[PDB]
């Protein structure tokens, strides 16, 4: 900032972080809706609420409860989407204060979630941010093509 030529914004259920995309001149702001904020709830009841299509699921390595809790959430989040056509981009994150990280990586892989261990950094954000940027860059060219 101020080399930025465009700022993108992205709604992210976590169960404002600006991330610059390398090697771009673009900035992506993640609007992080921590469930139990309750940012998320304020938004769901909101008039014009559009649903959420990006998540960061976090769990504590030493609580299998919190991990399984993240799977429930993910399936819900998938089911709660208004627009079946847009997929649910999610990222699983391990962190400290039991859980088989080998098993956790797996599930995620099976389920097409990006995995990140934070015990004991911004990569899960960098990850959701690039994904989002990719859609922008695609839609944005479809638009240009649509209207010739």
């Amino acid at each position: 900032p101020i080399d930025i030529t465009a700022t993108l914004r992205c709604k992210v259920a976590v169960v404002v972080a600006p991330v610059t995309i390398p090697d771009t001149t673009v900035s992506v702001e993640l609007f992080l809706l921590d469930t139990a904020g309750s940012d998320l709830y304020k938004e769901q009841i909101s008039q014009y609420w559009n649903g959420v299509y990006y998540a960061i699921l976090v769990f504590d390595v030493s609580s299998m409860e919190s991990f399984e809790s993240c799977k429930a959430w993910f399936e819900l989040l998938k089911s709660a989407r208004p627009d079946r056509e847009r997929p649910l981009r999610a990222v699983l994150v391990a962190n400290k204060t039991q859980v088989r990280l080998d098993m956790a990586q797996d599930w995620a892989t099976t389920n097409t979630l990006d995995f990140f261990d934070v015990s004991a950094a911004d990569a899960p954000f960098l990850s959701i941010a690039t994904t989002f940027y990719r859609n922008y860059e695609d839609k944005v060219a479809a638009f240009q093509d649509a209207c010739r």
Partner: protein
């Protein structure tokens, strides 16, 4: 009589809520509907249009993509302090979309709010505001 949003006619965007330098506000006011301003995520987004002067407006026309709900407001003061509603409308899902609106209002400023879209992002290709 005349389209004062045109730009060669004084049209100017002053208060856009998001911008990518590749698809800037001014694209909405160049008569050429193959160019556009793009929203860059989340709704609503909005932008404020200033006319060369306060005119009796008879017809507002917007050309867009992926907009689901559109709201317009006016301000006939020299400073855009207080805006007043004019109309709010829901758009079929479409492929570009035209929304012509016969109106009878006085305005110096027009705020267009994209309250919601049919997808993640939406464009506005043309804003035409006719009067005299």
């Amino acid at each position: 009589m005349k389209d004062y949003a045109r730009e060669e006619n004084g049209g100017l965007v002053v208060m856009a809520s998001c911008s990518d330098e590749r698809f800037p506000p001014e694209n909405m006011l160049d008569g050429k509907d193959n160019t556009f301003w793009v929203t860059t995520g989340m709704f609503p987004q909005e932008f404020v249009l200033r006319l060369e002067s306060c005119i009796r407006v008879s017809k507002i026309t917007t050309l867009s993509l992926n907009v689901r709900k559109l709201a317009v407001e006016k301000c006939d003061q020299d400073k855009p302090d207080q805006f007043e509603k004019v109309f709010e409308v829901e758009l079929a899902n479409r492929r570009l979309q035209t929304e012509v609106h016969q109106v009878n209002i006085r305005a110096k400023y027009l705020k267009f709010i994209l309250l919601q879209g049919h997808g993640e992002f939406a464009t506005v290709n043309r804003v035409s505001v006719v009067g005299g």
